[PDB]
Structures are given as C-alpha cells and as structure tokens.
Amino acid sequence: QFAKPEDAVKYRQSALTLMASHFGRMTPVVKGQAPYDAAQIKANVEVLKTLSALPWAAFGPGTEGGDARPEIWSDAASFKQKQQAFQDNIVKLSAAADAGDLDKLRAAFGDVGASCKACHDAYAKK
Amino acid sequence: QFAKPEDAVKYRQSALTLMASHFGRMTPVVKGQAPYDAAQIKANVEVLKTLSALPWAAFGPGTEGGDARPEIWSDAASFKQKQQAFQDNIVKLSAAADAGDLDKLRAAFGDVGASCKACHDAYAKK
Ligand code: HEC
Numbered sequence A, B: 001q002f003a004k005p006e007d008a009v010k011y012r013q014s015a016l017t018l019m020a021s022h023f024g025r026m027t028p029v030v031k032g033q034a035p036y037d038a039a040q041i042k043a044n045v046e047v048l049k050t051l052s053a054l055p056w057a058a059f060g061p062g063t064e065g066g067d068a069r070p071e072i073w074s075d076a077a078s079f080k081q082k083q084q085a086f087q088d089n090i091v092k093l094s095a096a097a098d099a100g101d102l103d104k105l106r107a108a109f110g111d112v113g114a115s116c117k118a119c120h121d122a123y124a125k126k
C-alpha cells in the first residue's frame, strides 16, 4: 500500500504512536489512580486490538529505512517471534477486558507491557 | 489521555496518517486498476471504520495548537458538523463493503472522499 519505502516508515511510526496511546492511557486505571469502568476499558481494548495488528506489515519485506535497528530485516524471523509474543499477549488482554475484572486486567496489562519492552530493547535505536 | 496538549497534536496527526492510508490504498481497486476481492475490502473497511472515529477527540476542548487552522476550536460546532458528515459517509462505505458489490463501493468511496476534502479545505493550513 506504500508508493515508496518512506511511506511505510511514516505509516509504522503513526501506528506505533497510536497503538501506544491506547495502551498507556490505561496505566492510571491499572494502578488504581483512576476509577475502573469495565465498559470503558472493554471499548478501549477493542480499539487497541485493531491498532496492535497494524505496524508489522509496514516493517516487512522492502521496508528497510527509518530510525529502527537493521536486524528487523536482517533477522526477520526473530522480529516475527517478538511480534507473535506481543499479539498473543494482546489476546489475553482482550479476554481480561471482556471479563470485566480488574485483577485479570492488571495481570494481562503487565504481560503486554513486558512484550512491548522486549521488542523495543532489541530493535529500536540506542 | 494526553499529558500535555502537544501529545494530542502528535496523536491526531498519526490518526489522520493511518486512517488516510487505509482509505487511499483502495483507490486502485475503485478505479479497476487492481482486482476487486470483496473479502479483502470488507476487512480493510473494518479497519478504516475503527480509525475514522479516532482523530476527533484529540481536536476537542483544550487541544489548541499544531498546524491546523484555529477555527477548529473557535468554531467548534462547525468542525463537528463536517465530522458528522464524514462519519455518516463511513457508515455508507461499511454497508457497501459488507454487501460485496463494486458499484456500491465506488459510489460510497466517492461520498467519503468528498467529505475528506471538505474538512481539509476549511480547517487545514494554506
Ligand atoms: C516489536 C515486535 C515491537 C512491539 C511488540 C512493540 N514495539 Fe514499539 N517499536 C518497535 C520498533 C522497531 C520501534 C522503532 C520505530 C522508530 O520510530 O524507529 C518502536 C517504536 C515505538 C514508539 C515510538 C514511535 C515513534 O513514532 O517515534 C512507541 C511510542 C512505541 N514503540 C510503543 C510501543 C508500545 C506501547 C508497545 C506495546 C503496547 C509496543 N511499542 C510494542 C517495535 C515494537
């Protein structure tokens, strides 16, 4: 869907920015600093589910460039592993949000956050 | 969800960039230059449906700034009108995509595109 590889760069940066806002905006709820409204969180996690699927195609074949570390493309199998892990953690977060229990939300949110951190430690520039 | 108003700016720019890629990537299909796969388009329009709801809250009260024209906030009622129009056109595009007919897709895609253009003509900087 990208006329030139730089268009893939701009797309994935935007996808990560959004996806991220939709994860991080729940931090005060998970910590108990903001109230837990099960319906609010269920709706937000549905948006995060959609967004969480979007960056990865724009890091695929022929999208070399941008600021990210080059092992995304030179070790493509290993970037897909970190991706599978993250997308599986998102499914667990959707289940917690759909159940409407804050304890399960806290646990799944931690699971997702650790998988965010893992990929960033390996593949973002230092 | 934004720590400072600049975070709303970065969010809405990203939302518009994505949402836009998901609309514009269908142009070759609408024109007949790429093949029409009803299931492919239905899935893409579901992603566009989600994205199309996201920019507007980040142009709401207290989000003044960025590059956009100031009438977004000084004439907030009139920006919401152009928004209602766009979101209603998106519902028509979802119906066309779910029906799986290229003729209806072409018509609804034109309807959406005109509503994209209208808001940009009024509210983006020149
Ligand atoms: C690997 C499979 C990733 C997963 C899982 C997550 N992120 Fe990530 N992220 C990844 C890369 C390779 C980069 C570098 C992109 C670049 O601009 O060089 C990023 C970057 C981000 C950013 C910054 C984006 C920007 O436009 O500057 C954010 C805000 C971000 N990542 C957040 C984030 C969150 C919250 C995640 C889990 C919910 C997450 N990322 C997962 C790779 C990967």
Ligand code: HEC
Pocket: B012, B013, B014, B016, B017, B019, B020, B021, B023, B024, B066, B067, B068, B069, B072, B079, B082, B083, B086, B112, B113, B115, B116, B117, B119, B120, B123, B124, B125
């Ligand atoms: C008014 C209710 C809008 C509707 C409907 C659409 N867009 Fe728009 N768009 C709007 C504003 C006020 C701006 C300016 C933002 C800025 O950065 O100053 C934009 C901008 C865009 C952009 C550029 C974003 C960027 O990061 O530079 C794009 C790619 C864009 N708009 C596309 C777009 C599409 C495809 C639309 C219909 C599917 C659409 N916009 C609708 C306001 C409004």
